[PDB]
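Re: the multi-chain job from yesterday

Posting the exact lines I submitted so nobody has to dig through the queue logs.
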Amino acid sequence: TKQYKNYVNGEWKLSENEIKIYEPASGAELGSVPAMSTEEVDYVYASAKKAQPAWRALSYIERAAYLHKVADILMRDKEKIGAILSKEVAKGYKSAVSEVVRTAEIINYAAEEGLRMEGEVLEGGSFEAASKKKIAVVRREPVGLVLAISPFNYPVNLAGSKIAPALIAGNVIAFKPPTQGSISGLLLAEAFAEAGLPAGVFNTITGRGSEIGDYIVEHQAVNFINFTGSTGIGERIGKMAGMRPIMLELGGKDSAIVLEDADLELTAKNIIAGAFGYSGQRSTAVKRVLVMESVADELVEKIREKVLALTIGNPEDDADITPLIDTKSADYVEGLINDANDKGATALTEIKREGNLICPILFDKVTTDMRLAWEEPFGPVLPIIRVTSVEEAIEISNKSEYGLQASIFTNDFPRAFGIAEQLEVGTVHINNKTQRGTDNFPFLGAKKSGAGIQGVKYSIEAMTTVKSVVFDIK
Amino acid sequence: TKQYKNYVNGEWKLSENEIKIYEPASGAELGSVPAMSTEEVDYVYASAKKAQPAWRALSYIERAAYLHKVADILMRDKEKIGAILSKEVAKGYKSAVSEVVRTAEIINYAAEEGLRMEGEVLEGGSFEAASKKKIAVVRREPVGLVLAISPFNYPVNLAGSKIAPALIAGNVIAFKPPTQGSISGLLLAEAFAEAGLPAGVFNTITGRGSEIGDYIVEHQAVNFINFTGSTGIGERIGKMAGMRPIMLELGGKDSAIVLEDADLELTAKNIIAGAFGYSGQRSTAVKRVLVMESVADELVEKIREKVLALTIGNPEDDADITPLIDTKSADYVEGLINDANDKGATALTEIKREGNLICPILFDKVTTDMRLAWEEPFGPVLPIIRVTSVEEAIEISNKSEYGLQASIFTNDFPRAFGIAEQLEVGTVHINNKTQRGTDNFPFLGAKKSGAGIQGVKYSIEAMTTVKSVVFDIK
Amino acid sequence: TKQYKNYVNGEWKLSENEIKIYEPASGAELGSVPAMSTEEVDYVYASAKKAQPAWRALSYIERAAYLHKVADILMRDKEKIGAILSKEVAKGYKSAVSEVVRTAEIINYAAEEGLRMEGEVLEGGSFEAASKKKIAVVRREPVGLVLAISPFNYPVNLAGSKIAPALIAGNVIAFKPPTQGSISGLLLAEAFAEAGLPAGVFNTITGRGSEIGDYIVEHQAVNFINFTGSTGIGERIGKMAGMRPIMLELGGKDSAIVLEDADLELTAKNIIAGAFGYSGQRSTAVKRVLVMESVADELVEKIREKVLALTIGNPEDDADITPLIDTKSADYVEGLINDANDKGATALTEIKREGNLICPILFDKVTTDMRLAWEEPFGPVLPIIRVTSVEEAIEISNKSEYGLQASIFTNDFPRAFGIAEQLEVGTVHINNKTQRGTDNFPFLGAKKSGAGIQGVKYSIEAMTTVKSVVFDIK
Amino acid sequence: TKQYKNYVNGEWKLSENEIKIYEPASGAELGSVPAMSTEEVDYVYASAKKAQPAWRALSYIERAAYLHKVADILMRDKEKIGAILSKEVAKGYKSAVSEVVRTAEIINYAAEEGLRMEGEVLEGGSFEAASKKKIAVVRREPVGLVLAISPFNYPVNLAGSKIAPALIAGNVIAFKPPTQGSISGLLLAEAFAEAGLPAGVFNTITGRGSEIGDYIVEHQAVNFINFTGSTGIGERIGKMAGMRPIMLELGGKDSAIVLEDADLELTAKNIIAGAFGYSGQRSTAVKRVLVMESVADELVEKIREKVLALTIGNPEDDADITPLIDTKSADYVEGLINDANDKGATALTEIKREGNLICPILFDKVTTDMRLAWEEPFGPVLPIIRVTSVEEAIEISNKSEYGLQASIFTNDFPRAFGIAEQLEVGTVHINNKTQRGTDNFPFLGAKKSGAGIQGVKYSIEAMTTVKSVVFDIK
Ligand SMILES: NC(=O)c1ccc[n+]([C@@H]2O[C@H](COP(=O)([O-])OP(=O)(O)OC[C@H]3O[C@@H](n4cnc5c(N)ncnc54)[C@H](OP(=O)(O)O)[C@@H]3O)[C@@H](O)[C@H]2O)c1
Ligand SMILES: NC(=O)c1ccc[n+]([C@@H]2O[C@H](COP(=O)([O-])OP(=O)(O)OC[C@H]3O[C@@H](n4cnc5c(N)ncnc54)[C@H](OP(=O)(O)O)[C@@H]3O)[C@@H](O)[C@H]2O)c1
Ligand SMILES: NC(=O)c1ccc[n+]([C@@H]2O[C@H](COP(=O)([O-])OP(=O)(O)OC[C@H]3O[C@@H](n4cnc5c(N)ncnc54)[C@H](OP(=O)(O)O)[C@@H]3O)[C@@H](O)[C@H]2O)c1
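And the result, structure tokens for all chains:
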């Protein structure tokens, strides 16, 4: 049980009810996190709004100082946190430690990027002569209270990516980690507690995403909603937000276009690492291959042999393929598998499920009439759709309701660049698997994949507004 | 009747049903505008989405070229359009002509500002050594189809402010003017038709905002909703938008803080011109004076004498105070007047209504318990709230549900600048009435006053997204 | 004779002495331009400094207005000016007209780019907590009087490229065109005169570059020296400038690296148009080919056949190859030709000179020991240096004392991009002949090729300074 | 003697000849620094140019890493270094330690500011339709070898301010500290040595500024000259630089304009701290007061009483006023004192010199005909010039050959802002003594006060160039 507590207004607090967390792989009970009540949610928010003024009052240098202390601590206790996070979400140990490190990176980067964010002075004379002596001194300002909600696959990394950019600007935070990953989320909160930030500046909220979900978003105290999860909730949040600003990173069905002149080995390598990373439980993974027929056979054989080299097993053993987050999920994946299989798809690797451990499947001959060709599995299954023209590949790629990223494997760069302009995605990688790729670059998604632009700098601009003082020079 | 038609996919079209427009002041019938059906709305949208690709294909120089042609034509026919616009919304002739001119200005400014909007190149090495040879070539892109909805008080000016920034970037437009101001809105469309933009690039939609309102917003073809109107609809739009981007300029209750060291004459002059402009039918007008008691009496007397100099009458006569847009409105204002009056407010000028022509009223001694102290009238009524400290004035100012702009009349600039940081508004004017002030400066509103940042440059960034091509340098 | 006059302080003035100008090709006398005295140079400068304050006082919109009027006029009289410019510097008619048009473009572009140049607001708190309430409002300002000196090959285009960016910012100008091209330079001044700019804002200075050269540069009234010419003068100017800012575009020996995978036809086409443009009298022309041995033979044959298609003759006949600016020049070129020839080079096309008309020569087998391999001819002679490795080509390319631009013809873009980082030039073109390429892009040169960065935006920043007002917010 | 060595290509080296350094106050021998020969200077430069390529090859993150290590070390040994620096240049102990701290700050700030410096992508279509598919990927690059020369009053602070911004960008350094301050300069080099930067990246050059001065600047290996010292040498450097880029911070005679509505107490406080800081041995000190007659008497009395409170004595005792750097200097100051005195100035405080310790003098009634009214003393002497109009004060202020900074003490900010536009300085402080003010703000000087813009960000842009790769999208 252990009984983890929330960090609220400078204090750790338990609740009348709890939620027991178990290890997706072994089944062991890791502990229990609070099941907050709306009354409690109200005190978190009240504490934050109360403390916002004086946080804003601090200097950027001082706020950046705290953020650095937090990241330092994270790096210190990276193995401790990694060991648990690994267990809580069935992620390989080493990989789980990496998540803690990349979080420290994002926190530090966000800290330094935040104190170098500047304003602008505008001339009335640029618009009309009569206003030549009129100027506008424009400076940025925080939006207020920011609600951050991280996903199960990156409960820590995708939490700091919201927390740090928000805090450096002068906003206050209310962190709501995923229930499955709430211990890890609270382990992160420990870092913010030790760093010593003023009481009320950083707060956590745990509990039944059903019991308190809509409540926390609809609350009038929240000025900005920063979320990462499924399209379904993202959509609800967009409506519950009203006219309040939001940042949403929803799902994705990232394609990998392979032209006739591509480096099939370089391509097979990138597609495997992208498609099967974390058992396909990544929104930015390569979810479908649109390969030109003439090179389909050769490419597919490479991918096939490469799949046969992926280790399958337990987190503690750093297996490439580990048990999916839960049964509801592994079942869903199983559905997509069958449907494709039934419709004629060709599994080049063995279809087999051990509990919630689904072995990596390579389906060749997948078609547009299969669910696997469009629906986001979030499991180790990769469909290969054979096209006969770059024109068709673009058409099929754009058809998807999603638009996170895309990949183009070719040697003709001017072409790759031209295709890239046509793909309805946020980012196109020319010769490399899709990845968030250094958190300094902008990250965004077209269509149902989200709302808003991410990346340290863009996150900071998003969660800030502008105040403009205009005066006349004598 | 005349029977004005919509501009759809390069053609002017009537509908089975029409809506007759009458002059707010005289009552004369100006003509009739189409009452579209959802079937028709579907063709407007279908035409636009069909034409978007090739508009995006053009060069910025070519798109900017068309926009300049439009503005040229507007300047040419400024009297023609002004004469009607003046009649349709009871605006003074000269002033109505100014609206047409300022629209040409915004269109030209948006055209040149648009072709100088550039991208950025990012270094993988700024984040992590291992990615030093990885770069991100980031360029802007249009969002697609943009729905522009202008208000009755600026059916033309607040239409071009959305249309031009949107088109230069590569977006297509579906213009929906207010029913009262739909002839003027269609007069503007004539300019876009003569300019010769490709068919489907610019389109108009007219009809019962009730019969087709939600339909046009909720339509899945619309990628961005740019609106200007009441808070009530703005709120509906924020929900109907879902997770699609929006720009909303709602209401306002702009305060004018007058400190003990202010230039009472300079102040009285600015407050009058702000408060009584267009009979108070401006979202950015000075709607409440928070004056320090020690100078309240003197200041109020100046304002009083100045009010007595405002001409009252008909549009064609360029009267300062003209008939309110309609009866529903003049009634609402009458309500606020009585309530304040009943509660003890002191009308320093005569309360009198002739049809829909309400004479300018100056209410001294207004208090927090009066509706006039918080609700946006949109009529010629100005409340004077006497405070006893800058601290109180800030408190009362921030209490309002609105946050468009504010004014501070003082000589202590460092103070004015400090106060400005505390006011929950988008812009603070130090010694001058609130105004949009040269459409190149950013324009935004805090709280219920809106969502998004305006001003030519900011409008262009808002209705654009970003595509990021990442590659590795060998 | 005609007897052209200088435009000084709003008036056209002749001088006691004149300089007669003759047509490089026919020999006819075009007319005569003033041979100013230092006394007269002092009045030009005194007029400018006197008028600077009130030009700065105008609004950007007003200054941009004048600049547009100038460009309009240029476009109007493009044939008139083109006809003479063509004769004065032995440039093809059509091409000379193009120069006038591109000048109008640069003037308009500079005008609009100039009124959108903005300032910045900085936070004391970004550096140290104790200064959190301290801010710096930074705005640009003009440097004052700018001296612009254009070259003979672009007496008009390379004059406006300095004049427009300088004037829009608030600086005043003293234009000194090349003696051979001074009629065309004065023809441009006519445009600035008709546009009606205030007296003293724009002024011309003509005369013996020997008699008045150093005098005009060393004068204490000049705040910035913007020059385009030979390395020799550029160097003198750098010393005579002292610690005053300068912009220098000197010579160049641009290489064109051709890798084994290049499109030899696309390459031969680009190299010909670059190398033989204006008879090689372009600083940005392809002056040496560093081709990989394996493709040297095939490539060279294409270039050879293509050279044989270049028309040779008179300006009025739009010949590809026209008479060189003068005898001193054609002689120098003849020297380089012989030396190479003597040393073993292989002329694949006929060596022949008719007066000052040297026919286009293609020298294969040129080596490092030849003058043609390093010295800038400024005549229609192209050396082909055969290398055996990209490593060698880079080495040979960088050896040159020049560094304007370079070209890489290959299909391996990541490679091209990697090579580009190693080349000591200002710009690298991947698959295309070197060109200034749209005057919006930055233009600069490494090593002896210059000092400063050009391109409309960069030119504007160069000829401006910054004023920073710092104050404390209460 | 100790016998300090230079840090050259990763090694510490003595020279055949040395220069013995003595403590300005006590006279004690601190030690001896090398007196290099041009042969040695050639090896420093050869080492640097040799190592430049691979330093540029590193990632920004790695270069920033080294810079942070250096600053950490400086903070560690701040007392050690402070103790000596205090002795070497007669600076108060505590103050000397502050110099070491502020250096660490600038080094760290420069490190983080450097890795967030980005490029831009330009559109051919912004200029001309035909080039719409042409784009320019512009990225920054280092200039190469940078020569940094620090002053005696900041041998360390004004060295790091050049070193850090230069190194983070990819340049190599050759540090030349002032002879009087060369031990401290070499103490700084120790930090760069311990940090472990690659050999040849950072180097020091010491020796007779006469014996090797021009040699080190004129050397063809140096690509950029960054200097801080007297106007005399600055001017020589501007000529010896040729057309190579430079950064020069020369002298100053900063005025403090005091209007009739100023806070005389707040003003007297700021003027004393600025004027008498480091015995007036600061280029940014308040060197002349231009006060409106009506408040001259009252203001002057405050300043007078405040002067009487300044401690006078030895460095180790943290005296406000310590011995001037040397006799040649104290003599020069004595000259200015007498001249003014002879001409009628009125010393309100005692004129007295003890060796090289000149007591702080306040001269009222100074006039334009006195040397003290224009010449930069660099000693504790403050002239009060009484004016009768803001117009006159501006006139007198601008008359000076210098233009570093200025101060305006008034309550009328719009006026202060208007005056500021007229003052020929780089920075204007409204109500506060002149100061460099947080090294993140831009720092520059008008007229003979320098060439180039400083401040961490601006320093980085200055010592960098731009490479532009242009290509066509298919
Ligand atoms: N700068 C400005 O112009 C400015 C600033 C602030 C506030 N305003 C507003 O201008 C308003 C005009 O009066 P109003 O009460 O009629 O406000 P409003 O309904 O918000 O008017 C604005 C626009 O809303 C349209 N509309 C109504 N329902 C719709 C819906 N369901 N979905 C989409 N569009 C719909 C109207 O067309 P129809 O007229 O046919 O219904 C009109 O084009 C004022 O009340 C004031 O708040 C203007
Ligand atoms: N087209 C280009 O943009 C382009 C680009 C790169 C290089 N170039 C250069 O154009 C050059 C043409 O030869 P050039 O003889 O014209 O070279 P140049 O004399 O150095 O340059 C010509 C310009 O400088 C003036 N000038 C000469 N001596 C001067 C001095 N002492 N001080 C100030 N100005 C002085 C000339 O007037 P005068 O007529 O009286 O000499 C003319 O206006 C080539 O060598 C080439 O390097 C042109
Ligand atoms: N804030 C400040 O730091 C600041 C600001 C403005 C003005 N100042 C100036 O600082 C000066 C203090 O130094 P100073 O009086 O000796 O003046 P200075 O010589 O101009 O400046 C000293 C620096 O210049 C070096 N140097 C001398 N001749 C050189 C040459 N010809 N080529 C290259 N470098 C050379 C010196 O070497 P050596 O010392 O070995 O001769 C030393 O590092 C004062 O005159 C004052 O006007 C300081």
